[PDB]
Amino acid sequence: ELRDQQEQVKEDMETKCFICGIGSDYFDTTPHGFETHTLEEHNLANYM
Amino acid sequence: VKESKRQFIFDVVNEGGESEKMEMFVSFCEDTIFEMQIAAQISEPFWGELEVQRVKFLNYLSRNFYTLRFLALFLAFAINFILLFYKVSDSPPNMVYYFLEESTGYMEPALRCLSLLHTLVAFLCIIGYNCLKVPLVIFKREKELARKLEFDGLYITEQPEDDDVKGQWDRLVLNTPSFPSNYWDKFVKRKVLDKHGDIFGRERIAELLGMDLASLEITAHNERKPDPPPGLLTWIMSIDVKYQIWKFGVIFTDNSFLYLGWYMVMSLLGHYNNFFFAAHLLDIAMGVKTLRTILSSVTHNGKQLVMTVGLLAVVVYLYTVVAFNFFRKFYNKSEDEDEPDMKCDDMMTCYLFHMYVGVRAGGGIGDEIEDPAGDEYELYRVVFDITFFFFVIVILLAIIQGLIIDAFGELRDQQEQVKEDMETKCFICGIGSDYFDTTPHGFETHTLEEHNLANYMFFLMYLINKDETEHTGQESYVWKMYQERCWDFFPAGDCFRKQYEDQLS
Amino acid sequence: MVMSLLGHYNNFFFAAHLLDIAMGVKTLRTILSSVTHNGKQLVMTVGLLAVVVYLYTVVAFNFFRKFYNKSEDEDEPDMKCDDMMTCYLFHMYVGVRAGGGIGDEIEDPAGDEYELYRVVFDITFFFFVIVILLAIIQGLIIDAFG
Amino acid sequence: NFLELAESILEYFRPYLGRIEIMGASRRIERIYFEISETNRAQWEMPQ
Numbered sequence: 225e226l227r228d229q230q231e232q233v234k235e236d237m238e239t240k241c242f243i244c245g246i247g248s249d250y251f252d253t254t255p256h257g258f259e260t261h262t263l264e265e266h267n268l269a270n271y272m
Numbered sequence: 273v274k275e276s277k278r279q280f281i282f283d284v285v286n287e288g289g290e291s292e293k294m295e296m297f298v299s300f301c302e303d304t305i306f307e308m309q310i311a312a313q314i315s316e317p318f319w320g321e322l323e324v325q326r327v328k329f330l331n332y333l334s335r336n337f338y339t340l341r342f343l344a345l346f347l348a349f350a351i352n353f354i355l356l357f358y359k360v361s362d363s364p365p366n367m368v369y370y371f372l373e374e375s376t377g378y379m380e381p382a383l384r385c386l387s388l389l390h391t392l393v394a395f396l397c398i399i400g401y402n403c404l405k406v407p408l409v410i411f412k413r414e415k416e417l418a419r420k421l422e423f424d425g426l427y428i429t430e431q432p433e434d435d436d437v438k439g440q441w442d443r444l445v446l447n448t449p450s451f452p453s454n455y456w457d458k459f460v461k462r463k464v465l466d467k468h469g470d471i472f473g474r475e476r477i478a479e480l481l482g483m484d485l486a487s488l489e490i491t492a493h494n495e496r497k498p499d500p501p502p503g504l505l506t507w508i509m510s511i512d513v514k515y516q517i518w519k520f521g522v523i524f525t526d527n528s529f530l531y532l533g534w535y536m537v538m539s540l541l542g543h544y545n546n547f548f549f550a551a552h553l554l555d556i557a558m559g560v561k562t563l564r565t566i567l568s569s570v571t572h573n574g575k576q577l578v579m580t581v582g583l584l585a586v587v588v589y590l591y592t593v594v595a596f597n598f599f600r601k602f603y604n605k606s607e608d609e610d611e612p613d614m615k616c617d618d619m620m621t622c623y624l625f626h627m628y629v630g631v632r633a634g635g636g637i638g639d640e641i642e643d644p645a646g647d648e649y650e651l652y653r654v655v656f657d658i659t660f661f662f663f664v665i666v667i668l669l670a671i672i673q674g675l676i677i678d679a680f681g682e683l684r685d686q687q688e689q690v691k692e693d694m695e696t697k698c699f700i701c702g703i704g705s706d707y708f709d710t711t712p713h714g715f716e717t718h719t720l721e722e723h724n725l726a727n728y729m730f731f732l733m734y735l736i737n738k739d740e741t742e743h744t745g746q747e748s749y750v751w752k753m754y755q756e757r758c759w760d761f762f763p764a765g766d767c768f769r770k771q772y773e774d775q776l777s
Numbered sequence: 778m779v780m781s782l783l784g785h786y787n788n789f790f791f792a793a794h795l796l797d798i799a800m801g802v803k804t805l806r807t808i809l810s811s812v813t814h815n816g817k818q819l820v821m822t823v824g825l826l827a828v829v830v831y832l833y834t835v836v837a838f839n840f841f842r843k844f845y846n847k848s849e850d851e852d853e854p855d856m857k858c859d860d861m862m863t864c865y866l867f868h869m870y871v872g873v874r875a876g877g878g879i880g881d882e883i884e885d886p887a888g889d890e891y892e893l894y895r896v897v898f899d900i901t902f903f904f905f906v907i908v909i910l911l912a913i914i915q916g917l918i919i920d921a922f923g
Numbered sequence: 924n925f926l927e928l929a930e931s932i933l934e935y936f937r938p939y940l941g942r943i944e945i946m947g948a949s950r951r952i953e954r955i956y957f958e959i960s961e962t963n964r965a966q967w968e969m970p971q
């Protein structure tokens with residue numbers, strides 16, 4: 225169960241945006257779309 | 273090459289990220305192109321004759337490296353089967369004599385012959401590894417160093433962290449004349465000079481990289497055609513000591529080479545004492561894939577297992593402290609009344625007794641120590657025993673077994689995840705199979721024809737071999753991006769079918 | 778049918794037919810499929826156990842022979858480890874089956890120059906063979922179930 | 924052309940140029956550009 229919890233956290237962060245919640249599948253339509261979105265557009269560090 | 277491709281796919285899917293996926297793919301393509309070169313070289317077709325024979329022998333060893341490795345295992349097993357017949361006697365066949373006890377009498381000469389053959393085969397295995405697998409190690413090391421120099425300025429703009437031994441060791445090879453020996457880019461030194469020659473200084477860059485600026489100009493000025501004789505003295509003069517030292521450091525810091533060296537050392541020790549050949553039976557773990565996976569189950573959580581053993585030691589130490597302070601009288605282990613053997617009259621002896629006997633006991637320390645019935649500390653000591661049994665014998669051993677089982681499950685999950693990722697998503701563009709399957713067998717056709725990673729690797733090989741002046745527009749475009757190390761040409765989240773969906777329909 | 782025919786030669790050969798429950802009952806078939814799912818891994822694990830026990834036997838034969846006397850009578854000593862084959866059989870047969878390993882059977886090392894070496898021998902035997910390897914087998918069965 | 928000429932300025936101010944997206948009063952997603960101080964960035968990058 226603990227391993228599953230850690231894996232779930234990793235998968236949730238890798239596949240879904242923390243702020244808007246849109247999946248990485250939509251963003252990846254553009255090359256590196258999810259990476260750009262989570263590093264520039266919707267960075268929680270930027271919000272803080 | 274298929275095994276390498278499977279391993280690379282497993283690595284990228286399990287551990288790699290999406291951002292660096294194409295870069296790792298291109299690195300895999302470069303490594304494979306070198307492996308095909310090595311395989312082509314080793315493929316089967318007085319100093320001159322000696323050199324020809326040496327090349328043929330080394331090629332044979334490289335070709336039959338794995339066969340030699342299996343022969344080593346077979347010889348070790350035969351040697352140990354013979355060893356099973358050793359006997360020890362006081363009389364020769366006060367010192368004890370070890371000797372074979374067999375009716376036939378052929379075993380002892382057979383034992384000597386098998387030991388000599390095993391040592392020879394171990395030496396041949398080391399040579400075969402050096403000739404077959406080491407070249408890829410040196411190629412990858414040189415490629416990484418060249419990329420770090422050119423694009424990261426590792427020794428120009430930055431410096432090694434001083435905790436990374438690889439970077440510190442790589443300083444040796446920078447100024448050596450033969451820096452890119454296995455790596456294809458023989459002009460990396462000049463590329464680095466041109467890129468960083470202005471900010472960091474051309475003369476200082478030349479000093480760092482062992483370059484001669486006048487020679488740079490003269491070589492382009494006119495050709496040079498030396499014809500040195502193939503003599504031993506000329507070869508010795510040609511040796512580059514610093515580069516050889518760096519290469520030997522890289523090799524000796526290689527796990528597989530270290531394993532083979534240990535194998536040969538143990539084989540040599542086997543002639544000193546035949547029983548040292550028993551260590552070679554451990555080679556089954558490396559040889560058999562099934563045993564390798566079974567042992568990977570254990571080693572997956574090795575750190576956790578070691579920490580659990582340490583926690584067990586600490587808990588047993590606390591139990592020892594309590595027993596030493598309060599329950600000494602129960603630790604007499606001598607039936608004789610005259611001579612008492614008190615295990616817990618000193619802390620070190622009590623701790624050894626606990627760790628050695630109580631942990632191994634089925635019911636804990638209470639199985640060994642004296643019965644507490646009819647004692648003023650009976651309840652305290654029965655609680656002591658029950659807590660020992662539950663915390664040490666039950667819970668902690670259960671923790672170890674659960675770690676092993678979870679390692680099994682995690683490895684199976686990793687394999688299943690790799691299989692599912694390859695079956696449901698395209699490796700190159702990353703579009704799911706659901707979109708492609710709209711057309712009959714759409715995903716299969718897309719992954720076999722449209723976006724075949726094998727086809728991409730074949731393209732790089734085709735672009736390298738084809739003359740530049742013959743490159744088409746698209747070929748020249750992809751070539752420039754390969755040379756500039758930009759992977760934008762790889763389709764990501766897009767495809768021909770999606771681009772022309774309306775027209776194609 | 779061959780076993781049924783043999784049963785007329787000796788009635789006790791009919792006991793072999795009780796194994797037919799595995800084929801007959803679906804539940805037992807699944808329970809046994811749990812074991813047979815990782816049968817190759819189980820057999821390889823048994824082989825690895827044999828090899829590890831062989832290494833322990835080699836070490837005991839070379840260094841710890843004196844502790845392998847299994848005869849109470851002083852006049853007649855029954856030395857299990859005076860030859861490699863007998864030592865290997867003793868190990869594989871008794872130490873593996875022992876709850877605490879080979880040290881449960883072999884003589885106490887207290888007050889010996891090799892006491893620390895032999896207690897390390899016993900502890901390593903217990904942890905690698907009794908604990909880890911049997912744990913590997915049980916984990917294989919559980920993973921097959923899952 | 925202006926962006927290419929200003930690459931140096933943009934590269935210099937990249938760490939200090941923070942961008943976020945919000946749901947504005949107009950009910951459309953709007954991008955806000957602000958300044959991230961060096962002290963704030965360092966404090967955020969502290970390991971704790």
Ligand SMILES: CCCCCCCC/C=C/CCCCCCCC(=O)OC[C@H](COP(=O)(O)OCC[N+](C)(C)C)OC(=O)CCCCCCC/C=C/CCCCCCCC
Pocket residue numbers: 587590591594597598652653655656659663
């Ligand atoms: C994760 C870790 C797992 C477990 C860790 C290891 C715990 C091991 C123990 C379990 C229970 C053992 C029962 C405790 C025995 C107490 C005996 C007692 O009470 O005898 C009354 C004494 C009389 O004094 P005296 O004249 O005989 O000698 C005193 C001077 N001398 C000591 C040098 C000569 O009075 C006294 O000492 C007053 C009390 C002295 C201090 C008592 C502290 C002992 C530690 C107890 C552990 C607490 C946890 C227990 C719960 C189980 C674990 C969950």
Ligand SMILES: CCCCCCCC/C=C/CCCCCCCC(=O)OC[C@H](COP(=O)(O)OCC[N+](C)(C)C)OC(=O)CCCCCCC/C=C/CCCCCCCC
Pocket residue numbers: 829832833836839840894895897898901905
């Ligand atoms: C995955 C595999 C799991 C485990 C595999 C099985 C390992 C079994 C062992 C565990 C520890 C046993 C402790 C070693 C005992 C050494 C005894 C010693 O040191 O006595 C000093 C001797 C004195 O010589 P002598 O006059 O008495 O007779 C010498 C001539 N003869 C031998 C025929 C008469 O000096 C010498 O022999 C010098 C040393 C001789 C060579 C020592 C090599 C012994 C092997 C040790 C295994 C290393 C791993 C240990 C770590 C635990 C596993 C993780």
Ligand SMILES: CCCCCCCC/C=C\CCCCCCCC(=O)O[C@H](COC(=O)CCCCCCC/C=C/CCCCCCCC)COP(=O)(O)OCC[N+](C)(C)C
Pocket residue numbers: 541544545547548549550551832833835836839
């Ligand atoms: C993954 C877990 C790894 C642990 C696996 C351990 C496996 C151990 C099992 C079997 C191999 C050792 C069994 C003892 C053989 C008899 C020894 C003997 O007899 O010592 C005696 C003492 O010579 C020596 O020590 C030589 C020096 C050896 C140095 C020790 C080297 C390292 C020890 C290694 C154990 C195997 C490697 C394990 C990996 C650890 C290193 C990374 C040799 O015999 P002698 O004096 O009667 O001379 C007979 C011939 N004349 C008549 C010439 C006088």
Ligand SMILES: CCCCCCCC/C=C\CCCCCCCC(=O)O[C@H](COC(=O)CCCCCCC/C=C/CCCCCCCC)COP(=O)(O)OCC[N+](C)(C)C
Pocket residue numbers: 783786787789790791792793
């Ligand atoms: C999945 C794991 C598979 C393993 C399962 C094993 C189950 C074994 C348990 C029970 C069945 C055997 C128990 C012994 C019965 C008494 C034997 C006896 O008594 O032998 C005595 C010797 O005749 C024989 O041997 C006959 C030749 C038999 C050849 C062996 C055939 C194969 C052996 C099989 C065991 C079962 C099959 C297992 C599968 C292996 C084959 C693929 C018979 O008796 P008698 O000489 O006093 O003559 C009494 C009658 N008059 C008075 C005429 C003189």
Ligand SMILES: Nc1ncnc2c1ncn2[C@@H]1O[C@H](COP(=O)(O)OP(=O)(O)OP(=O)(O)O)[C@@H](O)[C@H]1O
Pocket residue numbers: 237238240241242243244258259262263266267268269
């Ligand atoms: N809104 C979001 N903001 C930031 N990261 C997001 C967001 N949504 C998803 N992510 C993902 O979270 C991960 C953040 O990366 P990561 O946590 O490793 O950053 P880091 O700066 O290395 O921090 P740390 O070293 O503490 O892990 C990325 O995989 C990113 O895609």
Ligand SMILES: Nc1ncnc2c1ncn2[C@@H]1O[C@H](COP(=O)(O)OP(=O)(O)OP(=O)(O)O)[C@@H](O)[C@H]1O
Pocket residue numbers: 274275277278694695697698699700701715716719720723724725726
């Ligand atoms: N871009 C891609 N290129 C190739 N195969 C892809 C790609 N994306 C997904 N796949 C999938 O990867 C699998 C490749 O098949 P597979 O690896 O079995 O090939 P093979 O030639 O039999 O090689 P091997 O015998 O080494 O496994 C297929 O299931 C295929 O659909």
Ligand SMILES: Cn1c(=O)c2c(ncn2C)n(C)c1=O
Pocket residue numbers: 302305306456736754755
């Ligand atoms: C990427 N790449 C290679 O991978 C390569 C090469 N020459 C040989 N190889 C292997 N060239 C010129 C190249 O650009």
Ligand SMILES: [Ca+2]
Pocket residue numbers: 740741742743
């Ligand atoms: Ca042209």
Ligand SMILES: [Zn+2]
Pocket residue numbers: 241242243244245246261266
């Ligand atoms: Zn978002």
Ligand SMILES: [Zn+2]
Pocket residue numbers: 698699700701702703718723767
């Ligand atoms: Zn695709």
